[PDB]
Design a protein around this motif. Structure first.
Motif, short mmCIF file in Angstrom:
data_model
loop_
_atom_site.label_atom_id
_atom_site.label_comp_id
_atom_site.label_asym_id
_atom_site.label_seq_id
_atom_site.Cartn_x
_atom_site.Cartn_y
_atom_site.Cartn_z
N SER A 163 -43.70 3.12 -20.20
CA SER A 163 -44.01 1.69 -20.22
C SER A 163 -45.16 1.39 -21.18
O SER A 163 -46.05 2.22 -21.39
N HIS A 164 -45.13 0.19 -21.77
CA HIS A 164 -46.22 -0.25 -22.64
C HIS A 164 -47.53 -0.18 -21.92
O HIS A 164 -48.53 0.24 -22.49
N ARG A 165 -47.53 -0.56 -20.64
CA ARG A 165 -48.73 -0.53 -19.81
C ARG A 165 -49.30 0.88 -19.66
O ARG A 165 -50.52 1.06 -19.71
N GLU A 166 -48.44 1.87 -19.47
CA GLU A 166 -48.88 3.27 -19.43
C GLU A 166 -49.37 3.73 -20.81
O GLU A 166 -50.43 4.37 -20.91
N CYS A 167 -48.63 3.40 -21.86
CA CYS A 167 -48.95 3.88 -23.20
C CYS A 167 -50.20 3.19 -23.76
O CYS A 167 -50.89 3.73 -24.64
N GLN A 168 -50.50 2.00 -23.31
CA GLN A 168 -51.68 1.35 -23.81
C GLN A 168 -52.96 1.82 -23.10
O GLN A 168 -54.01 1.43 -23.48
N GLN A 169 -52.88 2.71 -22.13
CA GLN A 169 -54.13 3.22 -21.56
C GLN A 169 -54.97 3.90 -22.63
O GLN A 169 -54.42 4.48 -23.54
N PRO A 170 -56.30 3.79 -22.53
CA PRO A 170 -57.12 4.50 -23.51
C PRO A 170 -56.83 5.99 -23.52
O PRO A 170 -56.82 6.43 -24.58
N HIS A 171 -56.59 6.71 -22.44
CA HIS A 171 -56.28 8.14 -22.57
C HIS A 171 -54.91 8.47 -23.12
O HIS A 171 -54.61 9.61 -23.33
N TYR A 172 -54.07 7.45 -23.30
CA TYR A 172 -52.88 7.57 -24.10
C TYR A 172 -53.19 7.05 -25.51
O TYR A 172 -53.91 7.70 -26.18
N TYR A 173 -52.66 5.90 -25.93
CA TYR A 173 -52.88 5.41 -27.29
C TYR A 173 -53.69 4.11 -27.46
O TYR A 173 -53.93 3.66 -28.56
#
Length: 246
Positions: A163-173
């Protein structure tokens, strides 16, 4: 492709292998692509931006191997190389990483469908599988980040949509990822797209139809924890695709 499995072109008959001819005349692999109609291959702009001249490129369809010929393959020159005018690059997170190549043979023809050459359907607008859906990716990219060589045999693997919400976390991207991109990765981070896989297909089954959901675009390394593959979100570019293919 890190991990995953070897394959032949029969299992991804829309896969397009794009090469460039050098001054000197050496020919080297550039990027993957997908046949969306007999005359049109879709890919990533970053594959071409350094060398935007259409005379420079050769496209193969029905090819299973990198540096040897596959029986029944077709060779194409690039009649038109169309890059997205709103392309940009970040340190690496390219925006609007989408490109179109109009293909025609020396004998002035487009693609002829066969057992090894077929088109892939585009999605309907803003219609993607939900997060956690398993999709496939295909390419001749590195099998290990440390590798110097590309595999001689085509590969494919399965990654799950994030999800965009998961991927937009700082520890992701964080902010590197936009709603016009799709993240995908393995739950164990053990398989992934890598260098040389750019421009290739992310294919999902959406309501019983094999669909070009994504185009391999970028990532921070390959098969690294918290660092998914990033894909151009095709369902967000349909008007662009439709206008430019006329």
């Amino acid at each position: 492709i890190i991990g995953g499995e070897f394959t032949t072109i029969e299992n991804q008959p829309w896969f397009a292998a794009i090469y460039r001819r050098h001054r000197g005349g050496s020919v080297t692999y550039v990027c993957g692509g997908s046949l969306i109609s007999p005359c049109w291959v879709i890919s990533a702009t970053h594959c071409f931006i350094d060398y935007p001249k259409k005379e420079d490129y050769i496209v193969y369809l029905g090819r299973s191997r990198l540096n040897s010929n596959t029986q029944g393959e077709m060779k194409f020159e690039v009649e038109n190389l169309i890059l997205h005018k709103d392309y940009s690059a970040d340190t690496l997170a390219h925006h609007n990483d989408i490109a179109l190549l109009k293909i025609r043979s020396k004998e002035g023809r487009c693609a002829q469908p066969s057992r090894t050459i077929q088109t892939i359907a585009l999605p309907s607008m803003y219609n993607d599988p939900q997060f956690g859906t398993s999709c496939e990716i295909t390419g001749f990219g590195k099998e290990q980040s440390t590798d110097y060589l590309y595999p001689e045999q085509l590969k494919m693997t399965v990654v799950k949509l994030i999800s965009h919400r998961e991927c937009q976390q700082p520890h992701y991207y964080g902010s590197e990822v936009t709603t016009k991109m799709l993240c995908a990765a393995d739950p164990q981070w053990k398989t992934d797209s890598c260098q040389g896989d750019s421009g290739g297909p992310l294919v999902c089954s959406l309501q019983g139809r094999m669909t070009l959901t994504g185009i391999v675009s970028w990532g921070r390394g390959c098969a690294l924890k918290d660092k998914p593959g990033v894909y151009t979100r095709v369902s967000h570019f349909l008007p662009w695709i439709r206008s430019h293919t006329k």
